[PDB]
Each structure stands twice: as structure tokens, then as C-alpha cells.
Design a protein around this ligand. Sequence first.
Ligand SMILES: *[C@@](C)(CO)[C@](*)(O)[C@H](Cc1ccccc1)NC(=O)[C@H](Cc1ccc(OC)cc1)NC(=O)[C@@H](C)NC(=O)C1=CC2=CCC=CC2=C1C
Ligand SMILES: [Mg+2]
Lengths: 222, 233, 231, 240, 195, 211, 235, 244
Amino acid sequence: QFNPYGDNGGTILGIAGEDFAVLAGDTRNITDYSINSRYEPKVFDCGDNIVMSANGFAADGDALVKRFKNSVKWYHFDHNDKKLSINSAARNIQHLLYSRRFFPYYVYNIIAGLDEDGKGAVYSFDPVGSYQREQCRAGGAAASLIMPFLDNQVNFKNQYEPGTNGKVKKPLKYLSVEEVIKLVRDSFTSATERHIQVGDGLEILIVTKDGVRKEFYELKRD
Amino acid sequence: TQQPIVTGTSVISMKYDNGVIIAADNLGSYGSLLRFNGVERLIPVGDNTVVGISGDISDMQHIERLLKDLVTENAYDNPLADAEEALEPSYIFEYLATVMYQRRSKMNPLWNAIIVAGVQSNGDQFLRYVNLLGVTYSSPTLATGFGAHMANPLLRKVVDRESDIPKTTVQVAEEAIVNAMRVLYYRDARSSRNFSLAIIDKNTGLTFKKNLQVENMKWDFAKDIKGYGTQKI
Amino acid sequence: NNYDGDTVTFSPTGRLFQVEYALEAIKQGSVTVGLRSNTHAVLVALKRNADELSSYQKKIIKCDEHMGLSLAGLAPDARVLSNYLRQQCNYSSLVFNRKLAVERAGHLLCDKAQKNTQSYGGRPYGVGLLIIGYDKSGAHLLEFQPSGNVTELYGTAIGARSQGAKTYLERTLDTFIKIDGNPDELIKAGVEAISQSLRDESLTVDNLSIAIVGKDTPFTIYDGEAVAKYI
Amino acid sequence: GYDRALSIFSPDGHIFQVEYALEAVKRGTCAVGVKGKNCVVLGCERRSTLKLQDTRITPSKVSKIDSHVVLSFSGLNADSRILIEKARVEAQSHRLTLEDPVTVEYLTRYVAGVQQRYTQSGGVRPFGVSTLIAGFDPRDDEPKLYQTEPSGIYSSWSAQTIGRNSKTVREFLEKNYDRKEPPATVEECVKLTVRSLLEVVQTGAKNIEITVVKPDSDIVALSSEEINQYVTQIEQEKQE
Amino acid sequence: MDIILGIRVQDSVILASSKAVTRGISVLKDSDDKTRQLSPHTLMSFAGEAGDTVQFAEYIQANIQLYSIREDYELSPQAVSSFVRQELAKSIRSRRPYQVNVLIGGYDKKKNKPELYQIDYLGTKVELPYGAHGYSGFYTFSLLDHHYRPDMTTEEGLDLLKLCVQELEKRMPMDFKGVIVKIVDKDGIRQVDDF
Amino acid sequence: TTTLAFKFQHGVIVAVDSRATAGSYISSLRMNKVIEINPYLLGTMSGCAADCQYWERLLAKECRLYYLRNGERISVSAASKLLSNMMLQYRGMGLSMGSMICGWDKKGPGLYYVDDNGTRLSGQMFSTGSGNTYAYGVLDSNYKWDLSVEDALYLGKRSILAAAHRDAYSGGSVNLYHVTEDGWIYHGNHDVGELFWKVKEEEGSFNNVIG
Amino acid sequence: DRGVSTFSPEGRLFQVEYSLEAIKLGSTAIGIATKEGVVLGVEKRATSPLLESDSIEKIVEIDRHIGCAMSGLTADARSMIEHARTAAVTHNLYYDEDINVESLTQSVCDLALRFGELMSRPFGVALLIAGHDADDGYQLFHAEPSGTFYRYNAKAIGSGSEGAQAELLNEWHSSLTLKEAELLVLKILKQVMEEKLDENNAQLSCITKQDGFKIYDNEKTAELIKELKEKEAAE
Amino acid sequence: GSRRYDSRTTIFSPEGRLYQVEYALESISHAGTAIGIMASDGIVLAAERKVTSTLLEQDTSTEKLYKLNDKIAVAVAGLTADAEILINTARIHAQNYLKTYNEDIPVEILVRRLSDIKQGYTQHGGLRPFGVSFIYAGYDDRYGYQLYTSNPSGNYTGWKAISVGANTSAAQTLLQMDYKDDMKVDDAIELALKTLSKTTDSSALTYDRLEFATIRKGANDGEVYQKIFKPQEIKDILVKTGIT
Ligand SMILES: *[C@@](C)(CO)[C@](*)(O)[C@H](Cc1ccccc1)NC(=O)[C@H](Cc1ccc(OC)cc1)NC(=O)[C@@H](C)NC(=O)C1=CC2=CCC=CC2=C1C
Ligand SMILES: [Mg+2]
């Protein structure tokens, strides 16, 4: 029997800063125990200061991104070159996913950018179209490895202030872009060690009011 | 939904400094029966692209006809059909990738794994893979079926990453490909000695080699091997 | 006379009057000028208002990053045809990862318009279009007539009093074709060309509409204080 | 399918087919609607050219759309059945999807929409019918009376008449009906409705039909003798 | 849903229907009315797959109400039951059949007779003095076979109905949360508020 | 999940948890399981998250169109029915949705349960999701019509807490809402970790747990 | 006879031109755009005194930020309004935002030329679409059955249109207040109307960023009429 | 195109009349007269065959009176072929009703259905209307004995006595004169034949130029019987009433 779905592995991570946002993902593409590519870009600049990554089944991931990029283009045509806000893009993507409720895009989608007040924004989706705005989200193969670490090191969960012994929590101080990138690199380095589908390379897209910047880092190739 | 009947095995390929190389054997298998021994699975499109196909042969012949019709259609009302508005490897690949993904989305796939190798207008090397699921990826080396398991490891020792491409000559790349085809003949039960090889270079153009054979094979050591453990005679 | 009731009827001299009447709608429309060099292609359009309280009807429409047109005649028909071009440009990109050739875009518009001239019930398009673009074979300018006839030109003009601008371009042919790597000078030649079609009224800030596309220049439209530079 | 555009504009900006449909309404028997303080009355003319008629089984001029709404008309009789059927289906469809009966305004808006649709659809002619739609909204004691016409426009009326010689009875209603103080009782409302028809009808025998609609789905049709008593009292006061 | 009973006495029809609605392992409601008035003198109770029951009942209700308005006339219980049967017989060979069983209790004003019709989801119609759907009949029919007379009063019908419910409450493993009882007679439809 | 909603003297309370799971993995610690359809209408979410969001946001479109056509707010009864009819179109196609439509209209406060099967039930008190049994236990024993707004908000909050504790697939935080005739009122996000320890001490409950 | 989509020798669609004549017979509707809001006003024109004038609904809400006035064959407007309301709310569903006034107007105008031998004829009604969005601010559009729409600072449609438009030519300036615009609509309506203007046979409305689209009460309009009379008598 | 040849069958005249319906009625006025008379104990249907021949096989012939079901019959005036199309539709409708409700279709419901079909041809489709006028004679347990008529406009009305076809003006005057409410079937039979005998365009009214039928409760106990008269039976009733 023909199985229309497949698993291309990979892992993605989105973090929302105070006035910035990052969307990172490894560049390894796989089937079963083989490597297809050590560098196959997975996070894309979709225009209007929005970045996007559809992780899971690559064919459905490429199709969704392609359709959203198209949706942005037609949004400009139909509404006098108006900028598509991150919340509007998020709602649009929900309807793209649910159009295939009975033959789903097999991907976990994340977008990142800035909201209309200039603050950092991350939105995360499920294959069938449920979405919500988040501060921190890891998706894909090693998502379960990374998320707990981010709960601890980004939101300071289970961390209290010395001397008080559990009475006073660690205060939720904001993180800089340099601090976030450190947590991203360590997350993927740790995921690479313990997950066979994670490795080869790490590509990070950083979004600010100035635009979209890229950063690349090598990962272990074994 | 179907099952593949008459099939073609591995297609292997790699980038080198001035272009790309692609190769595939000339066998059409019918299950375990080595039925057809004169099957060409590398199909040139113009003088800048070669499409290598594995999997179901009936679907390959269908794809072969789509490409032949694509060239015809591109020439219609096109004075620059043999120049600026000629078919590019990227155009040919994206067309196939669109077809493959649509067919899988109708639950009626073309049961193939395809590698499109070529050189673009600006001299850039093109090498991308697509299969029955519509899955696409690119790499300095690409291989289908058994080639993915046995050829890629050998070809990646020559071009391990992007920066190794300018350091790799056509002689070295061809040597690596030819060695890989020998290894596949040793170890793939659904392969043949006879194969075809194509080189697309940005300077010397398209060189298509037919009726190649695997040579310099090691078998002599077999005479000494006796029994399956304790037997001496 | 007796042969102008519908598009499906030839006259005794072999004329199609409904198509000719559709052509007449273009002549009533406001003037628009098109011209190109080897590096860039420019559209210049005189926008028309209903009265002093009203806005000035937009004349130029973007089809892709590398292609767009200007209209003269029934504006809704231009919206239909430009929408078709947007889809065709987009089909070429999504399927073939290929920017649509300007010449092929003209062939597609010709064929779409033709079907409306041979079938009963429908009507011809009542609009003329000037398509500019930059593709793999350089800069291009096309003139579309709703009869179906599409023509590739160095320069042209359509609309009311368009003969004046067309004569100017016919004299200036050897000059403006050589304006390579200079967008501002090519626009100047277009603004000077469209000025030959003006009577009574002159080019004001909310009257003039300009568009340009080129080698390292996406299709962009200039309106308002952005064209005050060229007045 | 037959797609021919029958309703089209003319050089002077008129749709003749819609206007000729109004002429069919002008030919139809007179219908009148009067709303009192706590009721609405629908009066209807029956032309006495047709005797030997079986009044038990002959289609009545006033039709119930639901238990709380009624519809009378003037114009082509066969055309009115199609509107009534559609209206009745929509009334049940509304109860089924929204769990409330239709308001009188909603039902009117639907019927008017059907009429409008037949003025710009291919292969069809407009309805040669104008309707008076009356009733009370669920859990409301304010009377409702609307009018529709072939073009598809509709509006609310304190009192209105349609059909042949409607110009005359409208003239009567305009001078007799006071907005500041409408017919306070059922008697006064029926009396005014009968009086208005007596300007046009001819004989006050079997030519006048009256239907009273009160709040909370209380709809009754008056008999010949009951109406005849109104006819008697009106003329006896007139002899002075 | 589960238990729906019906009994036709001298001058009326009595329908008893359970109040329970279950979803998963939780009883969401214990006061649900599994019935719809089709016309002033015709009542239909129903039981079957979740969602389908109410949708079918309301669809039937809408059709009968439409008929009543069109003709200014109430259809006989026999005519209504035949209409309902045809809709179910039409349904059983559809792509997705409506899994609904019904009892139709009506008083025929022409013949001055109560009438009870039992129709299952296949479109199997039978006129009966007393009836039930599902497992309800397994417990109750022996009592009804014994005690039922055709000249019973409405009060005697209710007493025999109480005995049936008591037997159900004793021998069923299922808690159906009591029943809502409704009477259909010459004066129309009314609910017995204390049972 | 665990959701609940109940009518009382001063309107209707709506309380939900915020956990989302993908198997045994907790995919989300804080997910909004309430939808604000209009100032006088709320909708709870249990089952497939996508199905809940899509169809209830589509209901809000249809409830909004009702206001424009009729110049009047839709009833809770009519809104719930529109939703149940949507579910009936995709009958047997595999949708998983369990919601309570809560609001105030002309008839007073309204509460309707609606699920993927098309079931539509009016009632005073409902609870949906994997932890509804735990919530019902607290609700049934402590509910009255004569509840004060303060005590009612606590009941719905405490009932979710009970479920979040025992049910593995319920937790995160508690989102409270109060519906009045002037509209709904949000009463905040309450972390269960912190709320548990607080309730334990103040109430004296959860004696078996050590803290 | 002749085709419905036929061109005249002058290059105009006969049917579109004839529908414009029907609009000239319609009751007057006026719109004035200011920086404090857009005002919409209409002539009700009851055919009889027994007709309850408050049921005449020629001003209509499309969304909270978009209003609409009509003139001509007003029955034809119902399907246009229905489409506009659907388009406005559907865009809010897809994009979680208010829709641009221009985009809404364009959606309505796309219906216009969908006629042939689709509907059998063009619409016989013109619309004044007024609204506000964050990008282009307060806007007023005039949507015709030709499929064309012009933006206007001020516009009058209907039977007294050319006389009213000439008056709007002189009176409108870029610094008009909302109160000044209200009185200006009432002034021009009173000028072109057959019957004497009052709160029962004329209706006002406006759209502001804060309060959105609002139809004015008869009590509120009555005061503005009384305020108009006194200021005209002041000189 | 094709528009050139379209007669436009479904349009209003400037006066607000439907051209084709009016012209269809003009056609029907030349058809053989058909009369229906309703009595307290039954209904009579009488109709005149148009200028027959001696070589026409009368006993197997049927051009006027048709049976829709056991309780309902119709008299035809106009194009016979058009009438048979509608008759077969009405026969099917009666059976559909019987299958659905397990009760015989009420007369009016059948009449309304046929009249609605006629109406449709005047409002949409671009086809010519049916050039037929019916007299429906029937019985049901709600209203008892009923007479209706329908015409190409799709409008229908109930009657105590009525005529369609030729000379209806003269025929209706004669019926209005002699008809009384307490009348019986045997008297109604006589009235129907006497009216035809005076209105006929033929020289004399004979058995071979007539079709006749009665619907009587004159069936054994509470039930209704349809009697389509045979040629010899029409000859006998003509002698009995004193016409021949
Ligand atoms: C209890 C958690 C049940 O265990 C609740 O019922 C909860 C309701 C709910 C959650 C969020 C929003 C609205 C309502 N139900 C679920 O979370 C639901 C349970 C479930 C799963 C699968 C099916 O069949 C398809 C039915 C019901 N869980 C989900 O829907 C899962 C699939 N969601 C995710 O896995 C998920 C991952 C994710 C990543 C980023 C953003 C959102 C994400 C979600 C919702
Ligand atoms: Mg690894």
C-alpha cells in the first residue's frame, strides 16, 4: 500500500525577545537512517519581516511555505501594498492548514517576527491548524529534549531566590539577543549529542525592526 | 495506489568544479528476474540537463514523454528557444517536482526517484533530488536506492562539503563515480555491469557516454574461501 | 449598422463592429505613454478625475516583481486582464520556477481577448493596455488591443490625443533608446512625451502617474509627491 | 438552460417588465390592510362576476404563512401561490435553524428578496404580485403591517391598500386614519376596513372578506353574517 | 438514547421516555425530554445514536408543521406514521443512515380513537396497543401481556406504566434516571409533572 | 483537558485549564481554551484544538453576521444551534470537539453543551474533557443557585484544581470568566502550582499531599 | 432584439448607461468626508403619509468601521449589502483585522459587471460607501454599476445630484469639523428636496474612529435642523 | 445568434397580461364544450366530442373524460395531446401521495399541483404553455364532493357548476338560471345535457357526439363509484331526459 507521508527529521526553535525574535533550525535532511543533505535550508524569509519554518514531512513543509509566500504576495495586490502583520499571517496560516483537515499537511509550523507594537512575537501551529502566540517553542524531532531546558533557562521555572527557600521566585528579567543565541546554540548542541536526526548545521534567522539577519553555525556530522 | 513492476535501481551523481556528473545502469528488473538489459535511464533535456530516473520503468517512460513534450512546448512562439529562453535545469526540476507532489496528493504516485543534474545559464551547478512523495533535497552528492547507502559514503569522501567542490576536478569526480558503480555491482543484487554516464560541464557542454562496463574487478580471493566454518577442503 | 448587434457577426466588408466599438472606448480614455531603453522600461500615465472633490483614477497596475501595465478605457476590464496576468506570471513561478517572458505574456493576453470576439453571448474587452517588463532578454514594451492584436515596440502611446506623444517618440527614437543606466533621464523623456498630448490642463502632483522596471529595479509605481521631482 | 434576459433597462432608465408586472397588480382585486392599537385587519375584495362559485373550497385570498403571520395579495393568482409556498418553507426553515419563529419584518424581507431576484435573473419574468404581510412578532404586542411589490422594494405601513381602485381607498384611508389615535378596539379597526372597501366594492354581500389577526397567534376569519352587520350599521349612519 | 415506552388505552396514548444523556463515562443530563410534538394531537418519542435522533425528529416536525400550514388541516396519526416510515426506509439505504427508533402516539379526531405506532430505524412499522424499543421490551412486555386491557382508563394506564418502570429499575444494569411521561388524547398533549 | 461552566443567580461562571498534550508529552503549558465570540458570548474548547478554534471562530463570523442583518445580538440558543449544525455536516468525518456556549441574552443567562456528534443540550451545569469527573465531584456537592459572585468564581476555580491534580492530561493554569448582563468579565490566569499550595494551606484540603 | 453586453458606437455598454438613468430618478443621498469623520445623509421620500417613514432604510451598516448610503432601485442594493457584510466579516475571519474601505469597495464593484446571457442585468443602484481604516484614514467612495469607483471628499447622488454637487464644490474645505459637515448635508438636502425637510423625511448618519458607524436618532437630527434654521436666520 | 428567433413566451404585455396564456385561452374557446355540475349526492361530467365521423370507433375512443384515480376524474378542453402529458403527471402525483401517507390524495392538493405545473410554463423556461383547461370532479372525506377548474395561467377555482371550452358565456348563464343548492344527481344529469343541447354548434345532440360520466356515493354503502358512460348508456339517458 502507498503511504503518502514521510519523515524528514529536523528540529526547529523559536524565541521571542523584548524587541526581537529568532527562528532557528538545523540543516540536516534525512530518511530512516540515511542523510539526504547536510545543508537543506528549513527556515525561510517570507517577506514583511516574517520568518517561517514547517518542520516534519518536507514535501508538505515546502508546499505550505510556498503557499504562504503566495498569500503574502496576493495580500499586497488585494489590499494596496499593506504590510501583513504577524497576527494576520498567523490567522491566515490556520485557514491554509485546515483546508486539508482530512488530508493534513504533516508539519509543525512556527513563524516569528514583530507585533504591531514592535515587540517580539512567535506563533506556533499544529498540523491541522490550531495556533497560539508563544514566547518560547521548540518543534520537531528533538522538541521534547529542548523545551524543558527553555522552561528552566528562559522562564526560570523551578528556580527560586537563594536564602528564601522556595518562598520567592527568580524574577523574570528580559533576555538580550546575544543571550538568546547562546541558549539556542546550546540547545542544538545538546540535541545533536542525544538525537540522531539532529546535526550537520544550525541556521538562525533574527528579526528586528531593521530587518532579517542570518547566522550559521556548524554542528556535529555523525 | 499501485506497486512497481519493471524497475530500475540506483542513480548516482555528484558536483565537481566546473559541472556535474550523473550515472545509472542499463537494467530493467522484473522482481528478481533480470529481464531487460538495454534500458537507458539517463534522459538528456537539451544540451544543459540530464534527468536520471530510478523506480518503475513504465512511469519513467511516461516522464520521458512529458520532458520531450516540454521541449516542444517551450519552442512554441519562442525565438530565443535555443538561447536566453531555453529550458534550464531548475525549470525542468520544478516542473517534475510539481507533478510528483500532485500525483502523491491524489494517492496515485509516479513510483520513481529522480535526480536532475545540469548547469544553469550563469554557469552554476544544479543537482537536486525528487521522489514519489514529492520530497526534494539538494546536496554535493546525491544517490537513489542502494546508491544512497553505498555510493554517497564514497562520493562524500571526495566532496564532503560545499567548499570541496572547486577543489574537485572532472577526472577525480568521474573516477569516484566509476568506482561507486563497481561497488554497486558487487553488492546490489538488482544491478548490472553495463551502465551509462553523463557529464554536464559549463565549458565543454554535455558529454553522454553509453555502453560503459564495470572493470578491474577483484574475484581471485574467492578460490581460497572454503566452507562456512570448519571445512578445510 | 445591421451587423453591429453582436460580436459574432462580420459586416459585408469583413469588419467586426463590436470590436471596433470596443476600440473606440480606448480613444475616449485618458492618455498613457510607454517607452524603453536597453536597461529600463517606463510607463507614464495621465490620471483622470471626476471632479475637484474626487480622486484621480489609478492607471497603472503591478502584475509581478518584473512586469506591469498601464490601462486606457474600461477600468474593470483592465482589472480582469491584469488579474489574469498576475495568475499566469504566478503559475510560471510556482510550477517552473521561471519568471514569465514578456513576449509570452502578450501571447496569453491575445488569446484570452480573441475568445471573446468569436463567441456568442460575450463581449470584447473595452480596454487597451501597455505592458512593460524586464526578463532574460532585457527590457520590453508591449501594446495590447482588445481585438487581440499585441505588438512589441520601442515606445508608444494610447488614449485621447495619443497621436501627439506617438509622433514625439517617433522623432526621439534614436535618443531615448540609448538612455542606458539612467532611470531619471528615461522618465524625463516619457514625461516630455506625454506632455505633447496635453491641452488646457497641465501635469500636477496628483495628476501624474509613473512606473519603472529595469535590470536591478523591481516594478514600482510613483504617485503623489514622489513625481513632483519630474514636474 | 433558457438564460434569456427578459427584465432589462430601457434608454429612459426603466425596466418595463417590472413596470408591466405592476399593471397586472392594478388589474387584481383590491386588498387592504389596517393596523389598530392591539390588532391588524386584512380586507379583501371578491369580484362578483364569478357566481355559482363554491366558497368552501375556492382558494381564500388571505393565506397563513405561519401561526402568527398572514399574507394577502393583489395580482396574478397563480404567481402568488409560488411566493406563499416559498414563504411557508422559509418560515419552517427559520424555526428549524434559529429556534425562533420569523419576525414579520424578516418574512417580508425574504418574500421581497424572492421578487427582486426574479427581476435580474435570466430566463424568468417578474412576479405580477404585490403582497400585504401582517402579524405579530413572537412575545410582542406591537402590530406589524408590511407591503411588497414586483420590483422587490418593501416598507412598513400604518394602513395600506393595493390592487384595482386602490387609489380611491388609499384616498379614504389618508383622511380617515389618524396616527395619534389608531383604531383602539377590534370593532373600530374592522369597521374602518369595511368602510374603506365600501368605497370601491359595489355590493357589501359576499364581495368583502375580512381577516382579523391578534397577538399570540390569534387569527380568525369573519363570516358573511358578521361582515353583513358592519355593512348594515355603516349605511344606516350614512343616511343622515 | 435508551428507554422509550408507549401504551394505548381506551381514550388516550401514553408515552414514557428516559431522562438520562450520557457522554463517555459521565451522565451530562438527567432531565432530557426525548420527544417532539409533530401536531396538536400527535407526539413522537425517539431513541438512537447521539445527534441523529434530535436532527431526525426536528426534520419530521418541520415537515408536518409545513403540511399543517399549507392545508390548514391536521394529518391523521396513520398518515404521519407512514410519512415517517418512508423517510426511515429511504434513509437505511443512504450513504450514512439515520440510526433512530421512534414511537408515534396520536389521537385521531376523525375516528375518535387513540393510536400508537412503533417504527424502528430500518423503517419497520407496526400498530400496537403497547410498544417499546431496544431492550426495554424484554423486561416490560411480560407485564403488559398480563395486565393490559383495551378498555383501561388513563389512570390505570399510568399505574401499569409505573409497574413497568419499577421492573426496569430493578432488573436493568443501566441507570436511566427515571422517565418523563406524556399523555395524548382528544384535548391534545400534556405532561405528567409528578412521576 | 478540563472545562466547566454553570448558571447561577448572578449569571454564569466559566472555568478551564490550559494544558495541551501530544501523547504523554506536554506540548503546551498555557493554551487558551476559551473563545470570546462577542462581549456577551463565550465558548469553551475540549477535544481537537484545531477543530475547536476553527469552528468556533467560524461561529463568531456567523454570529456577527446575524447582528448586522438583524441589528440585534444572537441568542445563546441560536448560536449553539448554528454550531451543532456545522458539526452535522461533517457527520462521521472524524471531528473531535466538545464545547459549552455560555452567554447572557433576553431570556437571561444561557448555557448550552455542544459536541462533534451534533448533541446540543441546555443545562445549568456542564463539564467536559478528560478531567470532567473530578470537577463534577466538587461542583455537585458545593453548587447552589444562591451563590455569591466571589464564592462562585472560587468554586469553578477549585473544581478545575481538583481535576488538574488527579488527571494527568489536565493542568497548567486556570482561566476564569464571569458572564453578566453587561457582558463577560475576565478574572485572570491562575497558575495551578501556586494555586494548589495556596488552597492546601487556606482550605486545609489535600491533606494526603506533603508540603 | 440585441445583446445585454453590447457596445454602442461611442464605446459604451448600453445597459450600464441605461442603469445610470435609473439612478438619476432615485432619492438624493449625500456624503461629506472630514478629518473628524464622514457624514452620510439621505432623502427618505415616502410615497404616502400612511407609510411609516422609520421603516425606510436607505442608510445601512456594513461593518463597525464602514457605513453605506444608496440611491436608485434600492431593492437591488440588498444583495450588494449582503455581499459587502460577508466580505467584511470573512476578511476578519481570515486575517484577524478590519478590512480596508477601498478593498471592501473593490469587492462590491467586482459584482457590477458580472452580467450577461451570472445575473441578467446590471444593478440599478449607486452606493456611497463611507468608512475609516488605520492606513488611509477617513474615506468616502462612490460605487457605480459600471464597476468603477471614485474616492470623494464630498459627493451627492440621485435626482438632485448635479445641483447638490455644485453646492458641495463651493462649501467643502479640508478643515471642516463634523458638526459643520452635518449642517452642510442638511442644508443641501433641504435645498434639493421637493417636500419640506424634517426629522421624519430625512436621515443623518456618521462614521468616527472612536464610536464607529452610527445612524442618528430623529430627536438628534431634529435639533441639528433647528440649529440650521437659526444660523441661516443669523445673517 | 439564437436570440433572433426567440418568441419570448413568458412576458407581460404593456397592459399586464401574459400574451401566450391569453392566446391559449383563445384556442380553448374553439374546443368542445365540457360541463361539470356538483350535487348533494354526486357530481356530473358532460362533454361534447368535436365534429366526429361515422367511421370513428367510439366505444374505444377517449378525448374528453379521463380517470386520474378511483375518486377523481377530469374533463378536458383544448389540445388533447397536451392534456395527456398533464394527466399522466397527475396520476403519478396521486400515487406518490398514496405511497407516502397511505391515504387517497385530497382533491384540492392534486389540483394545486397540476395548476402549479401550468404556472411554471408562464413564468420560466421559455416554452409555450399547455393549451388545456380542466374540469376536476372528485371526492374526499374532508370537503366531500368538489368541482374545480384550471386554465393555462395556472389559476384554479372551485365551483358548484361550471363550463369550459366553447360557448361558456351562454352555458354559464343557463346553468346559473336553473341550478339550485338542494339539487340531486339525476336532476344535474338532466341540466348538463339540456345546457349542451342549447349551446351546441351542431344541428342536433346525439349519443355519438357525447362523453358522459358521474361520480356517485350511489355505491353499496359508504364509498364512491366512478361511472364512465358507454355509447349505449349515453343513448339511453338521452331518451330518458327527452332530448332524442
Ligand atoms: C485535554 C488536554 C485533553 O488531553 C484537552 O481536551 C485539550 C483541549 C484543548 C487544548 C488546546 C486548545 C483547545 C482545547 N485537548 C488537547 O490538547 C488535544 C487532545 C486531542 C488530541 C488529538 C485529538 O485527535 C486529533 C483529539 C484531542 N490535543 C491536541 O489537539 C494536540 C494534538 N495538540 C498539540 O499536539 C499541539 C502541539 C502544538 C504545538 C504548538 C502549538 C500548539 C500545539 C498543539 C495544540
Ligand atoms: Mg547527531
